[PDB]
């Protein structure tokens, strides 16, 4: 996955002694340390739990008589008063943590519950109350590893798509239609447990760095936005492996644009841009690059909503004709000059590509730089060649896409700024 800290908070931890600890969560580990107040950083490490060993995270029933420091009834209190407990359940008994606020406890529980979907020894039951004086107060059982006495409200074993085990059973898939092929081979439409529509990407053996994708899915499983194609899970206990996603009935945006019968109004085209920009603002906020943003990599559902697809997947492509910046399959005509010249990938190369995508949308799927080959494009865009204003784009709309192609990456806007510009034009109309 990634070594990035997803959540950082100061909590009160129970050993019976209670101590303030800085908790840091990564997809790999939940670690806690003494808090270096003076330096505003972590102090000495005091322990850690491997995320793969966590079987359950849930609230705890509060103690009936907790001292003032833990009594339910801003700056000073949020680091001195900890009344809301939660438990992290793993092999070595539960770990009890007290949050200063309810919102913060909710945030940690929500995040941890999603993360542990990846794990293999998940439980359906837990202990609602504290283990104290050699027994659980809820059921009076005397073993710390005693099975939970109460079923979880949304136990993963019985949870629906997006909340269940990350590994999906392929025997629960029905295949109904061929959706064509892409960089990793065949894709199909089908049903999960006979009711839920899904897309099944079947990974051609030898096309993907599978072990890296499977591990790194720990990060991608946390990406969720209304305008991102949702990843539901994987099937990796067979050959080939499958990637299971949200199904988009209308296919890829590029082919959608090229279907002349739609006869889109320019308001509809701007809405497509807004959809994509919202997805990209979300990915930018998670410091996650797409690296092949283009109309061909966006999909359209049966409601006409555009969503961004296959973000982050370039990293696992084994084909050097795709990966090489001069390869026949590399997306040269969406690549910023710095990418082509120096392999300088950043949020700003995604911004460049977004501009070309806006141009595609207002050109109804025309090939960019049609008069030029990939090699010619690479040479001339580094000199200052730019895509001209599409006939359907107003000067104001063109200014947005044009801003994406500044020769200096740092003078390119962010997706937050682009979205603001798009919303302004929608109002102005
Ligand atoms: C994403 C995708 C690829 N492309 C890839 O898998 C791919 C892999 C890697 C990359 C990188 C280069 C970035 C690494 C890019 C793309 C190839 C084929 C289909 C789909 C796809 C997916 N989903 C989630 C749908 O809902 C859907 N829905 C469709 C719905 C309808 C139709 C359609 O109109 N059809 C089907 C066949 O022909 C008849 C009409 C087609 C697709 N189509
Ligand atoms: Ca269609
Ligand atoms: Zn119990």
């Amino acid at each position: 996955g990634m070594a990035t800290v997803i959540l950082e908070s100061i909590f009160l931890k129970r050993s019976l002694n209670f101590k303030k600890r800085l908790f840091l969560l990564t997809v790999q580990k939940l670690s806690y340390y003494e808090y270096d107040f003076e330096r505003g950083r972590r102090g000495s490490k005091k322990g850690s739990i491997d995320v793969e060993k966590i079987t359950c995270v849930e609230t705890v029933v509060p103690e009936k008589n907790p001292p003032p420091e833990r009594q339910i009834p801003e700056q000073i209190s949020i680091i001195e008063r900890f009344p809301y407990p939660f438990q992290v359940v793993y092999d070595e008994g539960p770990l009890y943590v007290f949050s200063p606020t309810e919102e913060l406890r909710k945030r940690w529980i929500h995040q941890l519950k999603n993360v542990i979907r990846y794990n293999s020894d998940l439980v359906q039951k837990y202990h609602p109350c504290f283990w104290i004086d050699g027994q659980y107060l809820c059921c009076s059982q005397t073993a710390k590893n005693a099975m939970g006495c109460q079923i979880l409200a949304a136990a993963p074993s019985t949870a629906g798509l997006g909340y269940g085990s990350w590994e999906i059973d392929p025997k629960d898939l029905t295949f109904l239609k061929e959706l064509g092929t892409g960089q990793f081979g065949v894709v199909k439409y089908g049903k999960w447990r006979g009711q839920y529509d899904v897309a099944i990407k079947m990974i051609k053996e030898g096309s993907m760095s599978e072990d890296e994708f499977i591990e790194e899915a720990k990060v991608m499983m946390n990406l969720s936005h209304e305008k991102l194609v949702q990843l539901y899970g994987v099937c990796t206990k067979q050959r080939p492996i499958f990637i299971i996603t949200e199904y988009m009935a209308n296919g890829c945006l590029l082919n959608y644009l090229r279907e002349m019968r739609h006869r889109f109004q320019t308001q509809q085209l701007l809405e497509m841009c807004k959809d994509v920009c919202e997805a990209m603002e979300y990915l930018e906020s998670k410091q996650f690059l797409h690296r092949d943003l283009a109309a061909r990599n966006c999909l359209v559902n049966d409601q006409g909503v555009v969503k961004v697809s296959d973000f982050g997947m370039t990293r696992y492509v084994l084909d050097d004709e795709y990966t090489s910046s001069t390869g026949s399959k590399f997306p040269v005509k969406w690549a910023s000059p710095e990418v082509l010249m120096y392999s300088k990938f950043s949020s700003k190369s995604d911004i460049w590509a977004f501009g070309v995508l806006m141009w595609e949308i207002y050109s109804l799927g025309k090939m960019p730089y049609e008069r030029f080959t990939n090699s010619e494009t690479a040479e001339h865009i580094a000199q200052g060649l730019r895509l001209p204003r599409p006939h359907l784009a107003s000067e104001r709309v063109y200014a947005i896409m044009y801003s994406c192609w500044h020769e200096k990456a740092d003078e390119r806007p962010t997706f937050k700024i682009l979205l603001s510009n798009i919303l302004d034009v929608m109002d102005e109309e």
Side-chain angles (χ1 to χ4, degrees), residues 1-15 17-170 172-429:
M2 156 71 70
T4 305
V5 181
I6 309 162
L7 290 172
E8 174 185 29
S9 301
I10 286 170
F11 287 143
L12 189 66
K13 170 181 90 56
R14 194 186 83 179
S15 53
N17 293 5
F18 298 72
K19 301 293 174 178
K20 302 186 221 188
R21 296 288 184 259
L22 182 71
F23 282 79
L24 301 183
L25 179 68
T26 68
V27 295
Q28 192 75 352
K29 302 187 185 179
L30 174 67
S31 297
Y32 53 93
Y33 316 74
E34 289 177 350
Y35 180 58
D36 188 331
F37 173 79
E38 294 292 322
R39 295 175 211 168
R41 300 144 131 79
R42 76 189 68 169
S44 63
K45 183 172 159 293
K46 293 292 179 175
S48 67
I49 306 174
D50 288 345
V51 171
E52 71 191 3
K53 292 198 177 60
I54 299 178
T55 65
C56 186
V57 178
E58 197 49 89
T59 58
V60 188
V61 174
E63 52 216 318
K64 284 185 71 170
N65 300 359
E69 60 149 24
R70 299 197 296 281
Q71 270 176 19
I72 303 180
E74 166 170 355
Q75 184 192 38
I76 300 296
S77 71
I78 204 162
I79 58 163
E80 284 184 9
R81 212 123 110 181
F82 308 94
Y84 310 93
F86 70 106
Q87 55 188 308
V88 176
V89 182
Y90 61 120
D91 47 18
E92 296 290 299
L95 170 71
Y96 297 111
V97 188
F98 294 76
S99 165
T101 70
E102 288 196 50
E103 185 282 321
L104 191 60
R105 180 174 66 179
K106 288 151 168 183
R107 185 192 305 173
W108 273 78
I109 292 173
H110 188 271
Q111 180 60 93
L112 277 160
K113 279 186 180 297
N114 187 64
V115 165
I116 66 178
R117 290 169 58 213
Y118 196 95
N119 297 352
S120 310
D121 185 64
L122 296 176
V123 296
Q124 319 313 319
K125 299 175 77 91
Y126 75 115
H127 297 283
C129 304
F130 288 112
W131 158 276
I132 187 44
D133 285 22
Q135 67 167 8
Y136 284 106
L137 297 171
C138 37
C139 55
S140 297
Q141 290 184 86
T142 59
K144 267 174 193 176
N145 61 355
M147 168 173 295
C149 53
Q150 187 175 305
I151 297 176
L152 291 163
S157 76
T158 167
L161 279 176
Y163 297 88
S165 176
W166 185 244
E167 284 280 343
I168 295 167
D169 189 342
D172 287 340
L173 299 170
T174 302
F175 309 122
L176 298 175
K177 175 169 62 167
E178 308 286 352
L179 300 182
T181 68
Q183 194 54 49
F184 299 123
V186 180
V187 187
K188 301 194 177 174
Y189 158 67
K191 298 273 196 184
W192 181 73
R193 293 186 175 165
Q195 207 200 328
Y196 299 95
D197 288 339
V198 299
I200 303 112
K201 205 193 290 178
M202 307 181 166
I203 311 307
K204 181 174 67 181
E205 291 192 311
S207 72
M208 181 187 280
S209 176
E210 298 177 16
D211 58 342
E212 294 179 29
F213 167 74
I214 289 170
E215 181 69 18
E216 302 177 13
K218 289 178 184 187
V219 169
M220 289 179 52
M221 72 187 302
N222 291 319
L223 298 173
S224 186
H225 188 277
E226 182 182 356
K227 305 302 176 58
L228 282 178
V229 173
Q230 184 68 54
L231 179 60
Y232 292 139
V234 300
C235 314
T236 69
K237 312 301 180 177
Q238 42 147 26
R239 299 170 62 203
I241 68 171
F242 296 167
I243 295 176
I244 309 305
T245 76
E246 179 172 6
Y247 173 59
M248 309 282 291
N250 272 316
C252 82
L253 176 61
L254 177 63
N255 292 344
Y256 194 66
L257 292 165
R258 289 176 177 178
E259 288 166 339
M260 285 184 301
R261 59 189 169 79
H262 299 304
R263 292 313 193 183
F264 299 111
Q265 293 188 78
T266 54
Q267 289 293 355
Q268 293 171 273
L269 302 178
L270 194 57
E271 186 70 18
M272 298 176 189
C273 298
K274 180 183 110 308
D275 288 340
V276 171
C277 199
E278 288 181 346
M280 292 310 300
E281 182 193 37
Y282 172 80
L283 293 179
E284 184 181 65
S285 80
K286 302 291 177 186
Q287 300 176 292
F288 192 99
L289 301 191
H290 192 297
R291 294 194 179 75
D292 195 351
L293 184 60
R296 63 175 174 280
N297 290 327
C298 294
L299 296 166
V300 186
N301 71 11
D302 56 1
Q303 309 301 113
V305 178
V306 180
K307 304 185 188 204
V308 174
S309 178
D310 291 298
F311 38 96
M313 294 301 292
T314 59
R315 294 175 296 169
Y316 312 113
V317 172
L318 294 182
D319 187 353
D320 293 321
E321 284 298 322
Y322 173 85
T323 297
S324 174
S325 61
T326 59
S328 69
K329 302 182 193 116
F330 183 90
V332 175
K333 284 176 173 196
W334 289 258
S336 63
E338 73 277 358
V339 162
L340 296 169
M341 297 172 61
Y342 314 123
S343 308
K344 174 73 179 176
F345 282 83
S346 76
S347 66
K348 303 308 193 184
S349 49
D350 276 355
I351 291 287
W352 181 286
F354 176 74
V356 179
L357 184 155
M358 286 190 66
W359 186 94
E360 294 185 271
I361 287 170
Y362 276 84
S363 301
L364 305 176
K366 197 183 307 178
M367 171 74 77
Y369 317 99
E370 64 163 346
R371 300 254 296 256
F372 306 83
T373 61
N374 282 359
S375 59
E376 289 170 334
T377 297
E379 175 166 17
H380 284 103
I381 60 108
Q383 296 181 345
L385 190 135
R386 299 291 184 271
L387 292 161
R389 181 177 64 78
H391 289 306
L392 292 172
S394 68
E395 289 298 346
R396 279 202 84 191
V397 169
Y398 185 59
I400 300 174
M401 72 184 71
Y402 183 87
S403 76
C404 295
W405 309 320
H406 200 286
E407 64 274 18
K408 296 205 288 200
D410 64 346
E411 290 198 12
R412 301 173 204 154
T414 62
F415 283 108
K416 187 169 162 68
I417 288 167
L418 287 167
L419 179 55
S420 184
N421 296 161
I422 290 167
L423 291 176
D424 284 354
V425 170
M426 286 182 67
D427 297 15
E428 183 280 335
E429 293 177 350

